[PDB]
Design a protein around this ligand. Structure first.
Ligand SMILES: [Mg+2]
Ligand SMILES: [Mg+2]
Ligand SMILES: [Mg+2]
Ligand SMILES: [Mg+2]
Ligand SMILES: [Mg+2]
Ligand SMILES: [Mg+2]
Ligand SMILES: [Mg+2]
Ligand SMILES: [Mg+2]
Ligand SMILES: [Mg+2]
Ligand SMILES: [Mg+2]
Ligand SMILES: [Mg+2]
Ligand SMILES: [Mg+2]
Ligand SMILES: [Mg+2]
Ligand SMILES: [Mg+2]
Ligand SMILES: [Mg+2]
Ligand SMILES: [Mg+2]
Ligand SMILES: [Mg+2]
Ligand SMILES: [Mg+2]
Ligand SMILES: [Mg+2]
Ligand SMILES: [Mg+2]
Ligand SMILES: [Mg+2]
Ligand SMILES: [Mg+2]
Ligand SMILES: [Mg+2]
Ligand SMILES: [Mg+2]
Ligand SMILES: [Mg+2]
Ligand SMILES: [Mg+2]
Ligand SMILES: [Mg+2]
Ligand SMILES: [Mg+2]
Ligand SMILES: [Mg+2]
Ligand SMILES: [Mg+2]
Ligand SMILES: [Mg+2]
Ligand SMILES: [Mg+2]
Ligand SMILES: [Mg+2]
Ligand SMILES: [Mg+2]
Ligand SMILES: [Mg+2]
Ligand SMILES: [Mg+2]
Ligand SMILES: [Mg+2]
Ligand SMILES: [Mg+2]
Ligand SMILES: [Mg+2]
Ligand SMILES: [Mg+2]
Ligand SMILES: [Mg+2]
Ligand SMILES: [Mg+2]
Ligand SMILES: [Mg+2]
Ligand SMILES: [Mg+2]
Ligand SMILES: [Mg+2]
Ligand SMILES: [Mg+2]
Ligand SMILES: [Mg+2]
Ligand SMILES: [Mg+2]
Ligand SMILES: [Mg+2]
Ligand SMILES: [Mg+2]
Ligand SMILES: [Mg+2]
Ligand SMILES: [Mg+2]
Ligand SMILES: [Mg+2]
Ligand SMILES: [Mg+2]
Ligand SMILES: [Mg+2]
Ligand SMILES: [Mg+2]
Ligand SMILES: [Mg+2]
Ligand SMILES: [Mg+2]
Ligand SMILES: [Mg+2]
Ligand SMILES: [Mg+2]
Ligand SMILES: [Mg+2]
Ligand SMILES: [Mg+2]
Ligand SMILES: [Mg+2]
Ligand SMILES: [Mg+2]
Ligand SMILES: [Mg+2]
Ligand SMILES: [Mg+2]
Ligand SMILES: [Mg+2]
Ligand SMILES: [Mg+2]
Ligand SMILES: [Mg+2]
Ligand SMILES: [Mg+2]
Ligand SMILES: [Mg+2]
Ligand SMILES: [Mg+2]
Ligand SMILES: [Mg+2]
Ligand SMILES: [Mg+2]
Ligand SMILES: [Mg+2]
Ligand SMILES: [Mg+2]
Ligand SMILES: [Mg+2]
Ligand SMILES: [Mg+2]
Ligand SMILES: [Mg+2]
Ligand SMILES: [Mg+2]
Ligand SMILES: [Mg+2]
Ligand SMILES: [Mg+2]
Ligand SMILES: [Mg+2]
Ligand SMILES: [Mg+2]
Ligand SMILES: [Mg+2]
Ligand SMILES: [Mg+2]
Ligand SMILES: [Mg+2]
Ligand SMILES: [Mg+2]
Ligand SMILES: [Mg+2]
Ligand SMILES: [Mg+2]
Ligand SMILES: [Mg+2]
Ligand SMILES: [Mg+2]
Ligand SMILES: [Mg+2]
Ligand SMILES: [Mg+2]
Ligand SMILES: [Mg+2]
Ligand SMILES: [Mg+2]
Ligand SMILES: [Mg+2]
Ligand SMILES: [Mg+2]
Ligand SMILES: [Mg+2]
Ligand SMILES: [Mg+2]
Ligand SMILES: [Mg+2]
Ligand SMILES: [Mg+2]
Ligand SMILES: [Mg+2]
Ligand SMILES: [Mg+2]
Ligand SMILES: [Mg+2]
Ligand SMILES: [Mg+2]
Ligand SMILES: [Mg+2]
Ligand SMILES: [Mg+2]
Ligand SMILES: [Mg+2]
Ligand SMILES: [Mg+2]
Ligand SMILES: [Mg+2]
Ligand SMILES: [Mg+2]
Ligand SMILES: [Mg+2]
Ligand SMILES: [Mg+2]
Ligand SMILES: [Mg+2]
Ligand SMILES: [Mg+2]
Ligand SMILES: [Mg+2]
Ligand SMILES: [Mg+2]
Ligand SMILES: [Mg+2]
Ligand SMILES: [Mg+2]
Ligand SMILES: [Mg+2]
Ligand SMILES: [Mg+2]
Ligand SMILES: [Mg+2]
Ligand SMILES: [Mg+2]
Ligand SMILES: [Mg+2]
Ligand SMILES: [Mg+2]
Ligand SMILES: [Mg+2]
Ligand SMILES: [Mg+2]
Ligand SMILES: [Mg+2]
Ligand SMILES: [Mg+2]
Ligand SMILES: [Mg+2]
Ligand SMILES: [Mg+2]
Ligand SMILES: [Mg+2]
Ligand SMILES: [Mg+2]
Ligand SMILES: [Mg+2]
Ligand SMILES: [Mg+2]
Ligand SMILES: [Mg+2]
Ligand SMILES: [Mg+2]
Ligand SMILES: [Mg+2]
Ligand SMILES: [Mg+2]
Ligand SMILES: [Mg+2]
Ligand SMILES: [Mg+2]
Ligand SMILES: [Mg+2]
Ligand SMILES: [Mg+2]
Ligand SMILES: [Mg+2]
Ligand SMILES: [Mg+2]
Ligand SMILES: [Mg+2]
Ligand SMILES: [Mg+2]
Ligand SMILES: [Mg+2]
Ligand SMILES: [Mg+2]
Ligand SMILES: [Mg+2]
Ligand SMILES: [Mg+2]
Ligand SMILES: [Mg+2]
Ligand SMILES: [Mg+2]
Ligand SMILES: [Mg+2]
Ligand SMILES: [Mg+2]
Ligand SMILES: [Mg+2]
Ligand SMILES: [Mg+2]
Ligand SMILES: [Mg+2]
Ligand SMILES: [Mg+2]
Ligand SMILES: [Mg+2]
Ligand SMILES: [Mg+2]
Ligand SMILES: [Mg+2]
Ligand SMILES: [Mg+2]
Ligand SMILES: [Mg+2]
Ligand SMILES: [Mg+2]
Ligand SMILES: [Mg+2]
Ligand SMILES: [Mg+2]
Ligand SMILES: [Mg+2]
Ligand SMILES: [Mg+2]
Ligand SMILES: [Mg+2]
Ligand SMILES: [Mg+2]
Ligand SMILES: [Mg+2]
Ligand SMILES: [Mg+2]
Ligand SMILES: [Mg+2]
Ligand SMILES: [Mg+2]
Ligand SMILES: [Mg+2]
Ligand SMILES: [Mg+2]
Ligand SMILES: [Mg+2]
Ligand SMILES: [Mg+2]
Ligand SMILES: [Mg+2]
Ligand SMILES: [Mg+2]
Ligand SMILES: [Mg+2]
Ligand SMILES: [Mg+2]
Ligand SMILES: [Mg+2]
Ligand SMILES: [Mg+2]
Ligand SMILES: [Mg+2]
Ligand SMILES: [Mg+2]
Ligand SMILES: [Mg+2]
Ligand SMILES: [Mg+2]
Ligand SMILES: [Mg+2]
Ligand SMILES: [Mg+2]
Ligand SMILES: [Mg+2]
Ligand SMILES: [Mg+2]
Ligand SMILES: [Mg+2]
Ligand SMILES: [Mg+2]
Ligand SMILES: [Mg+2]
Ligand SMILES: [Mg+2]
Ligand SMILES: [Mg+2]
Ligand SMILES: [Mg+2]
Ligand SMILES: [Mg+2]
Ligand SMILES: [Mg+2]
Ligand SMILES: [Mg+2]
Lengths: 202, 117, 61, 150
RNA sequence: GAAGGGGGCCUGACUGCGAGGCCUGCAAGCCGAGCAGGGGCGAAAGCCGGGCCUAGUGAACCGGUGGUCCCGUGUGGAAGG
RNA sequence: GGGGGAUGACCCCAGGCGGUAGGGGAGCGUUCCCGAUGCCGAUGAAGGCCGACCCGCGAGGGCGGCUGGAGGUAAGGGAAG
RNA sequence: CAGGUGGAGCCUGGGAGUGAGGGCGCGAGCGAUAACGUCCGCGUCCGAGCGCGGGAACAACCGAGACCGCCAGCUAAGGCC
RNA sequence: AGCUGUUGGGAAGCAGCGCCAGAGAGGGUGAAAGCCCCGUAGGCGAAAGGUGGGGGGAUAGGUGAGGGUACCCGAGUACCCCGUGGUUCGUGGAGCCAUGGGGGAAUCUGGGCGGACCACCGCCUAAGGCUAAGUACUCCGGGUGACCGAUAGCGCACCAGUACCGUGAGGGAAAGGUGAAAAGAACCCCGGGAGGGGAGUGAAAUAGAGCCUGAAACCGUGGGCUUACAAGCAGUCACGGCCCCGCAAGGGGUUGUGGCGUGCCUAUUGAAGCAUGAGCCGGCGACUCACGGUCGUGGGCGAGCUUAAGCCGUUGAGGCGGAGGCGUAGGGAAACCGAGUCCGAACAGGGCGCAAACGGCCCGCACGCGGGCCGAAAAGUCCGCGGCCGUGGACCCGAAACCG
RNA sequence: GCGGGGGGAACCUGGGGAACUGAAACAUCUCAGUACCCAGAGGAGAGGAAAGAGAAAUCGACUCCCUGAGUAGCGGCGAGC
């Protein structure tokens, strides 16, 4: 995909990008599965019959009692007993092939460009971290908060400015991940952020 | 996450308890005795649907074998008559004809013994 | 945990290039004051069959 | 592309086998373990790959690989790894046992020995040993040193 | 029409192998042409890798004994394999 | 299974379709997560009690009435006490 | 060598369950030309067809292999005071 | 940084015009609030006590070359032997470190070690002591959750290690919810009270304090149908009556007669079986997870594939990290050789091993060739998913017992 | 005059130290230097500045993680470690 519109105070030029021809919605899905898997807290636990509080004493003789047949009340048959095969803390992360992380990141951008919802811009002008100021610049740029925007820029102040918009997820350039791209309709980067993203792939 | 029984079990029990409406004693009150009964009723219906077909034909025959015994005739011969008479009608079911349309039956009796007498 | 190679198996069995399990031949070093020279001589290696599938499975690693 | 659009390809994500549930599930009651005794029991059987039910197993064959090692351990000695001519046919310049690791053929713990299979090339190939067939194959084109320093 | 009886020389009661099969759950058990080495009997064709045949048998492990190349824990040996 | 190039889930045609231990294949529902700064909701959430109605082979899903009085959560996916 | 396209055959692999059978017929052994006895062989059914018809009732004798519906028809065994 | 109108018991809902945002996390407020309340982003704060591994400053302390002398260099010690322990080493060829017993040195030309022993070549200086950090844990405080939500979660959400049981060690529970607000029902009537009936509060009082929702077993009151010459796994298929709904045809309820009819589960060759289990209802209750392996499968990259621990980064943002692993060569006990190798005297024989797959574009003669190219595919490897296996309590429950 | 004494969830070092179980019996082996008892320490404890490694004329205290590696070996050469 090559037809990507840059945005300078001089005029809305056009930049050409390499970006893969076709996308792989599976690989894309695979990366997202991973991104959300690793961030899992894996913090759900339960107690086994050995970790329960009760004594180990046999509850009744075992014969001639006329009752059923038991050992300790920490057994899972008992109400208040241990839990069979319940959850313990565990690490849901795995190591998704790096060559795949790249691809997916690339394709995710491509897909956005392929539909023209991608946009590179320059210096903004609506900086000095104030949402009203950005919000003003955003207007003059087309972003009217009619669709969700993923703002990728290294500039600390611009992010402060956008952060609080319920339709804006703002992110640093080294933070570019595919999940955030696919949640947001529009993709808006600056040039000093397209460069880093450019060197990430390949 | 823990998925407790919640609401599911009570529902399945309600479904069957409703199908067991009108049954005797617990067979309509206890989910268990109800489900056992339904098993029974399930096979009875199925078997009894296949033998409802029998029980009627049986009836039709008796009805017929009587109306043509009025005209001096074995059901057994009457049928053979119509067989050779070409008359693949009667459809034994249609012997209310023998009850609603006597004259129309009598005429059939004639065409009956007419062939192979 | 890490599975453990079966040292008894490793000491007396070999896996070939094509995944065959090649073992020595039984019954030739103990009671041969005279078995036929043909008998004692026919002791090279052989191939276990459809049950080296099991031997293979305790060496894997 | 959208979050409600992701999903994966047909398979890739099969549905675990939830057995021991209800009938017509296919695997209920006996939970696919079929009545039985030992195997159906919890801890189940001993270990099929070895246990033969009391009879001597096939631990009845005699080790040959005589020399199993003794207590101080494995004896240090130069291990040679062979790489074929066909393999290094991709290189043009030098070829040193060092370079051949980076390429992904040598492996760091072994000394270099080039073998026959393949066709030679007019380059300077540095190694620890050469195969009969290999020394000839390339002597008809290029030149090659033998290593033994430090 | 010998596998039985008699005599003459001899030791193939060989070494290195083995096409192909019998049997067979495994492991075993069985038969075996042919090639090579060096032989025995025979004029020769040839036969000979014990015995008319089918029982006289014991996986592995652990050690003993005689060889032989092979390994020998810094190295030469040695210990031990 | 073979057709008719809709290529499915369409119409044809012809066959198979008892079933325990078991193998295989499709689905239904429960809890939780993304979808959610969203959407449904006091003109009434969840749950409950009816139903002769609608959809699905079935598991179920609807819809309507009464109760209840504050939650619920699509499509598409993900994970399991 | 031919016919035989069949929930046939063969090859490689993943998953099994079974390794307590039983009645009957036929062929033998054991037993007493005893057992609803026992042990094999070849078949069959029940097992898993305790679904359907006949046999008064009755897993295995006779008939017959139940996808679903019909207040239609022909039959099987067996029957028709 | 927000007011108004509107429905409503209640506005935060809907509507109309606005505003803040370095703050659109969240929790309250009569229902659903960025802008009402508490917070949130961003900042700020210690007289006193604790800390202070960071910056600064002191003090202790530390720092020479050559030549000669042979003075010192950790004793019941090294060393040897017997008995044992530790190490992967279970007496093994058994070293090393430790030491209960016996014997018992030396001080640089001294001693220990490199897996019996000897030589050679090297390593190191035993028998005195101290030493931050990187590491382990969580009574305690905090922050997070594809963690529980009152049979769950700690044994305990509630004055629980309590009641209660036990001589004692010890065992050990149950038990949460009116309403937005007590406005928690003055007074009157029946009653000894309890309780109820009016009145009254409330949006609601089958929200009335044995209080949210209020299922099932279970017990009642009323009504429809039905039953005292019929006999049975209780149903089912038919007809008919009577009651209800509907214009309608149809349907719902009940059951008089007729036909058919051996509960469920389990275990068995075989069960209605006079074989096991179950009074009934509600809730709890059993194929898991980790790490390896072996298949299959979805993808990535392919003679390559891939990182681990860590480091950096981080609104639940990713990246770096190539130690390492698997694969690319096999055969042999090994030395070793190698597309071969092993057995062998063999240039017999055999064992186990090596052999680039398609299309198409280029050329050497034209229809392929011969070898190359362009990329389809792929050995291999990596992650996900699924079957199964190994090890772990490994589907859940249950002993008689053993030991501290 | 100075100090000790006793207590602390787990963690740590030391002194002692099982059995069930596994080996589909059992004694060596395993479980396991585990459980547990005792002493002691502290916010940590241990360890620590080579009479070390071990084949490289090599490295340089100790602790901890990854790897080396289920390798080297150990082993009724069994189970297994
Ligand atoms: Mg306890
Ligand atoms: Mg307790
Ligand atoms: Mg316990
Ligand atoms: Mg006890
Ligand atoms: Mg009882
Ligand atoms: Mg309790
Ligand atoms: Mg609990
Ligand atoms: Mg997993
Ligand atoms: Mg990970
Ligand atoms: Mg990481
Ligand atoms: Mg935002
Ligand atoms: Mg449940
Ligand atoms: Mg009825
Ligand atoms: Mg019929
Ligand atoms: Mg006819
Ligand atoms: Mg002999
Ligand atoms: Mg499935
Ligand atoms: Mg199945
Ligand atoms: Mg089944
Ligand atoms: Mg199975
Ligand atoms: Mg069972
Ligand atoms: Mg059995
Ligand atoms: Mg049993
Ligand atoms: Mg158990
Ligand atoms: Mg067991
Ligand atoms: Mg035995
Ligand atoms: Mg003779
Ligand atoms: Mg002679
Ligand atoms: Mg052969
Ligand atoms: Mg023999
Ligand atoms: Mg003989
Ligand atoms: Mg043994
Ligand atoms: Mg020996
Ligand atoms: Mg030996
Ligand atoms: Mg030597
Ligand atoms: Mg050494
Ligand atoms: Mg030596
Ligand atoms: Mg020896
Ligand atoms: Mg020897
Ligand atoms: Mg088609
Ligand atoms: Mg059909
Ligand atoms: Mg079927
Ligand atoms: Mg299938
Ligand atoms: Mg589902
Ligand atoms: Mg959300
Ligand atoms: Mg609304
Ligand atoms: Mg209202
Ligand atoms: Mg309502
Ligand atoms: Mg819910
Ligand atoms: Mg419904
Ligand atoms: Mg409702
Ligand atoms: Mg209401
Ligand atoms: Mg939802
Ligand atoms: Mg729901
Ligand atoms: Mg879903
Ligand atoms: Mg469960
Ligand atoms: Mg043929
Ligand atoms: Mg078949
Ligand atoms: Mg097969
Ligand atoms: Mg298999
Ligand atoms: Mg048996
Ligand atoms: Mg048997
Ligand atoms: Mg038998
Ligand atoms: Mg049979
Ligand atoms: Mg039979
Ligand atoms: Mg019988
Ligand atoms: Mg006869
Ligand atoms: Mg008999
Ligand atoms: Mg019998
Ligand atoms: Mg027969
Ligand atoms: Mg059976
Ligand atoms: Mg039958
Ligand atoms: Mg059958
Ligand atoms: Mg019966
Ligand atoms: Mg019957
Ligand atoms: Mg009958
Ligand atoms: Mg019958
Ligand atoms: Mg059929
Ligand atoms: Mg049919
Ligand atoms: Mg007829
Ligand atoms: Mg007939
Ligand atoms: Mg009769
Ligand atoms: Mg009003
Ligand atoms: Mg207002
Ligand atoms: Mg508004
Ligand atoms: Mg925020
Ligand atoms: Mg309300
Ligand atoms: Mg509220
Ligand atoms: Mg709202
Ligand atoms: Mg809303
Ligand atoms: Mg608020
Ligand atoms: Mg508002
Ligand atoms: Mg702050
Ligand atoms: Mg202040
Ligand atoms: Mg501060
Ligand atoms: Mg201070
Ligand atoms: Mg300092
Ligand atoms: Mg300082
Ligand atoms: Mg000084
Ligand atoms: Mg001096
Ligand atoms: Mg001096
Ligand atoms: Mg000293
Ligand atoms: Mg010594
Ligand atoms: Mg010594
Ligand atoms: Mg000693
Ligand atoms: Mg020892
Ligand atoms: Mg021993
Ligand atoms: Mg030894
Ligand atoms: Mg030793
Ligand atoms: Mg020792
Ligand atoms: Mg020594
Ligand atoms: Mg010592
Ligand atoms: Mg000593
Ligand atoms: Mg010296
Ligand atoms: Mg040393
Ligand atoms: Mg040495
Ligand atoms: Mg000695
Ligand atoms: Mg040293
Ligand atoms: Mg010292
Ligand atoms: Mg210290
Ligand atoms: Mg805490
Ligand atoms: Mg929950
Ligand atoms: Mg909740
Ligand atoms: Mg409770
Ligand atoms: Mg509780
Ligand atoms: Mg509750
Ligand atoms: Mg606690
Ligand atoms: Mg409790
Ligand atoms: Mg308390
Ligand atoms: Mg008392
Ligand atoms: Mg007391
Ligand atoms: Mg309550
Ligand atoms: Mg309240
Ligand atoms: Mg409230
Ligand atoms: Mg009064
Ligand atoms: Mg009152
Ligand atoms: Mg009132
Ligand atoms: Mg009022
Ligand atoms: Mg009301
Ligand atoms: Mg009242
Ligand atoms: Mg109510
Ligand atoms: Mg009440
Ligand atoms: Mg209420
Ligand atoms: Mg109550
Ligand atoms: Mg409430
Ligand atoms: Mg209530
Ligand atoms: Mg009544
Ligand atoms: Mg009478
Ligand atoms: Mg009467
Ligand atoms: Mg009676
Ligand atoms: Mg009845
Ligand atoms: Mg009726
Ligand atoms: Mg009616
Ligand atoms: Mg009747
Ligand atoms: Mg009846
Ligand atoms: Mg009857
Ligand atoms: Mg039984
Ligand atoms: Mg029995
Ligand atoms: Mg029996
Ligand atoms: Mg009974
Ligand atoms: Mg009994
Ligand atoms: Mg019973
Ligand atoms: Mg029993
Ligand atoms: Mg039972
Ligand atoms: Mg009983
Ligand atoms: Mg009772
Ligand atoms: Mg229940
Ligand atoms: Mg796994
Ligand atoms: Mg797997
Ligand atoms: Mg950091
Ligand atoms: Mg491998
Ligand atoms: Mg090799
Ligand atoms: Mg090898
Ligand atoms: Mg040789
Ligand atoms: Mg040789
Ligand atoms: Mg050869
Ligand atoms: Mg070959
Ligand atoms: Mg490919
Ligand atoms: Mg692949
Ligand atoms: Mg398992
Ligand atoms: Mg137990
Ligand atoms: Mg005791
Ligand atoms: Mg102290
Ligand atoms: Mg103390
Ligand atoms: Mg003390
Ligand atoms: Mg200790
Ligand atoms: Mg200790
Ligand atoms: Mg002590
Ligand atoms: Mg000790
Ligand atoms: Mg023991
Ligand atoms: Mg075991
Ligand atoms: Mg045992
Ligand atoms: Mg055992
Ligand atoms: Mg025993
Ligand atoms: Mg041990
Ligand atoms: Mg202590
Ligand atoms: Mg620390
Ligand atoms: Mg320390
Ligand atoms: Mg120390
Ligand atoms: Mg020192
Ligand atoms: Mg030093
Ligand atoms: Mg040995
Ligand atoms: Mg050990």
């Amino acid at each position: 995909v090559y037809q990507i519109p840059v945005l300078s105070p001089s005029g809305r030029r056009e930049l050409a990008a390499d970006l893969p021809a076709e996308i792989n919605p599976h690989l894309l899905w695979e990366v997202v599965r991973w991104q959300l898997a690793k961030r899992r807290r894996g913090t759900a636990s339960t107690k086994t019959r050995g970790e329960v509080a009760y004594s180990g004493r046999k509850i009744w003789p075992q014969k001639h009692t006329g009752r059923a047949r038991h050992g300790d009340i920490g057994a899972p048959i008992f109400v208040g007993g241990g839990v069979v095969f319940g959850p313990k803390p565990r690490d849901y992360s795995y190591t998704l092939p790096k060559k795949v992380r790249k691809k997916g990141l690339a394709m995710a951008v491509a897909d956005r460009a392929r539909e023209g919802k991608l946009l590179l811009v320059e210096a903004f002008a609506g900086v000095n971290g104030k949402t009203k100021e950005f919000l003003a610049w955003a207007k003059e740029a087309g972003l009217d908060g009619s669709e969700s925007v993923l703002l990728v820029t290294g500039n600390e102040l611009v992010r402060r400015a956008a952060r609080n918009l319920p339709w804006v997820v703002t992110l640093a350039p080294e933070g570019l991940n595919v999940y955030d791209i696919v949640r947001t309709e529009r993709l808006v980067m600056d040039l000093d952020a397209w460069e880093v993203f450019q060197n990430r792939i390949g | 996450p823990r998925a407790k029984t919640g609401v599911v079990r009570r529902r399945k029990h309600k479904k069957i308890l409703k199908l067991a409406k009108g049954y005797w004693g617990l067979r309509s009150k206890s989910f268990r005795k109800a489900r056992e009964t339904l098993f029974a009723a399930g096979n009875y219906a199925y078997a009894h649907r296949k033998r409802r077909k029998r029980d009627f034909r049986r009836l039709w025959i008796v009805r017929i074998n009587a109306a043509c015994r009025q005209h001096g005739l074995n059901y057994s011969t009457f049928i053979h008559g119509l067989k050779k008479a070409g008359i693949e009608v009667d459809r034994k079911n249609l012997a209310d004809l023998a009850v609603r349309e006597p004259q129309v039956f009598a005429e059939l009796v004639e065409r009956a013994k007419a062939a192979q007498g | 945990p890490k599975m453990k190679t079966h040292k008894g198996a490793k000491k007396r069995v070999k896996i070939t290039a094509s995944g065959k399990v090649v073992a020595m031949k039984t019954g030739k070093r103990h009671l041969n004051w005279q078995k036929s020279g043909k008998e004692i001589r026919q002791k090279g290696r052989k191939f276990v069959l459809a049950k080296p599938e099991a031997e293979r499975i305790k060496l894997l690693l | 592309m959208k979050l409600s659009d992701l999903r994966p390809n047909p398979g890739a994500n099969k549905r675990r086998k939830r057995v021991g549930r209800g009938p017509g599930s296919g695997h209920g009651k006996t939970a696919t373990r079929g009545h039985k005794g030992q195997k159906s029991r919890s801890g189940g059987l001993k270990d099929p790959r070895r246990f033969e039910g009391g009879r001597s197993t096939t631990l009845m064959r005699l080790p040959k690989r005589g020399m199993q090692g003794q207590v101080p351990g494995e004896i240090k000695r130069p291990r040679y790894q062979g790489v074929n001519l066909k393999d290094l046919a991709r290189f043009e310049g030098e070829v040193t046992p060092e370079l051949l690791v980076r390429a992904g053929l040598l492996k760091k713990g072994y000394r270099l020995k080039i073998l026959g299979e393949g066709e030679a090339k007019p380059l300077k190939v540095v190694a620890h040993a050469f195969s009969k067939s290999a020394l000839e194959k390339l002597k008809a084109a290029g030149g090659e040193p033998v290593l033994l320093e430090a």
